[PDB]
Amino acid sequence: QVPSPSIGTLPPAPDFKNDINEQLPDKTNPVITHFSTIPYIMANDATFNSHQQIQYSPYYKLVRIQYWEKVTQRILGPRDDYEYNKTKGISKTDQVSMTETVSMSVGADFGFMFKGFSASLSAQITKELSVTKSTSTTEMTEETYKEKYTNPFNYELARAQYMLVNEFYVTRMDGTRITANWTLRDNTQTVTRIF
Amino acid sequence: PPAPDFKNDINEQLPDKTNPVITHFSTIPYIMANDATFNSHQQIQYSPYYKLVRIQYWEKVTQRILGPRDDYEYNKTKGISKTDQVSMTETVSMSVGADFGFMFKGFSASLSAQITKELSVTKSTSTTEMTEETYKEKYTNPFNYELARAQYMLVNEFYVTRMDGTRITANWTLRDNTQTVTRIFPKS
């Protein structure tokens, strides 16, 4: 039988458990949250030609994984500040792969850009993945930047921030990966934990 | 292999990426290789060492035909993504320093001399890991005639391999933005 990805529920970001010193997990367990079936004419397959797609993979699966990445964690002394690295967006290789395999890319607004034949299925695919159609005219980059936090209180405070990470990948009808996982770090979706 | 060029046609579209070639590899012991589908016994019996493999390929940074004296701005990428930095540390205990040398973490520091020698890479002296950055770069046609210009970047990719050749990682892409070749279409 044609396989079906197991859909999961993304749990809430890790939190503090009555401890100031508890190290919080760096990543949380990846959970398949969505997928969407696409015709073979949209999936340029590096090891499959037109003919064998038609008889062996007339459809492909576009899968969405989600998990929480720990952006940073730190204890701060009364009223102390500090800086940390924070990464947003999707890598350059990952955007070239997505555009070359399924004719898609991520725009500067975290939406999706649909190119070629892929444009006919935009409404289906944005719905089934629960992502939105981009209105941007430039592609998202990956950017690692510095972010400062100042402890506002006059007591010691642990603080950890988590970001929502997406991973996307395409798959033959029988389930064989034809790609690596394309990573998109959504910095508009962070959870902050203090104790 | 040589970077693509114009020969005698101004309008030629040049390749987006050359075909990747394997240029180096270094042998590493099973113990610094986190293999997700092998236990310690299977590694020792079936892949007592792994191959860290270095690949190279030219990537067209940009191509453009400019009218007389025309300028333009284009994208350009340096470095290595956070995911790729994170995978390399989880698999082989290494990452890329800010000076494009390799940082050896954990057991890997034992063999830094062997790996950098075998891979033809350098050991980083940096205290900071390389990131990935996309920035704009400007170019202006110096001539009062039409000019086609293409710039190529030499990209490095690294991946790990069981003794028998089985791929156990994605490709880790490193773009050193100072290793470039710049071709112009009327050369003289």
Residue numbers in the entry:
A (entry chain B): -3 to 191
B (entry chain A): 7 to 194
Sentences from the paper on this structure:
We also resolved the structure of Cry78Aa155-359, which resembles the solitary pore-forming domain, and found that it has an identical conformation with Cry78Aa13-359. After growing and optimizing the selenomethionine derivative crystal of Cry78Aa155-359, its structure was determined by the SAD method and refined to 2.4 Å resolution with Rwork and Rfree values of 0.198 and 0.249, respectively. Cry78Aa155-359 packed as a dimer in the crystal, and its two protomers were almost superimposed on each other. Structural alignment of Cry78Aa13-359 (Mol A) and Cry78Aa155-359 (Mol B) revealed nearly identical conformations, with a root-mean-square deviation (RMSD) of 0.566 Å over 175 Cα atoms. The structure of Cry78Aa155-359 represents the conformation of the CTD in the absence of the NTD and has a domain organization similar to that in Cry78Aa13-359. According to the structure of BinA/B, which has significant structural similarity with Cry78Aa, the CTD of Cry78Aa can be further divided into the sheet domain, TM domain and sandwich domain. Structural comparison of Cry78Aa13-359 and Cry78Aa155-359 indicated that the β-pore-forming domain in the presence or absence of the NTD was nearly superimposed, suggesting that the absence of the NTD of Cry78Aa did not result in a dramatic conformational change in the CTD pore-forming domain. Similar results were observed when testing the effects of the pore-forming domain Cry78Aa155-359 on the survival of the nymphs: nearly all the nymphs in the assay remained alive under the same conditions. Cry78Aa155-359 had an apparent MW of 23.7 kDa, which was in accordance with its monomeric state of Cry78Aa155-359 (23.7 kDa). However, Cry78Aa155-359 has several characteristic features of aerolysin-type pore-forming toxins. Sequence analysis showed that 20.5% of Cry78Aa155-359 consisted of either serine (7.8%) or threonine (12.7%).
Cry78Aa is a novel protein identified from the Bt C9F1 strain that effectively kills rice planthoppers, with median lethal concentration (LC50) values against Laodelphax striatellus and Nilaparvata lugens of 6.89 and 15.78 μg ml−1, respectively. Here, we report the crystal structure of Cry78Aa, which consists of two domains: a C-terminal β-pore forming domain belonging to the aerolysin family and an N-terminal trefoil domain resembling the S-type ricin B lectin. We also found that Cry78Aa binds carbohydrates such as galactose derivatives and is essential for insecticidal activity against Laodelphax striatellus. Bioassays showed that the NTD or CTD of Cry78Aa alone has no toxicity against planthopper nymphs, indicating that its insecticidal activity is dependent on the cooperation of both domains.
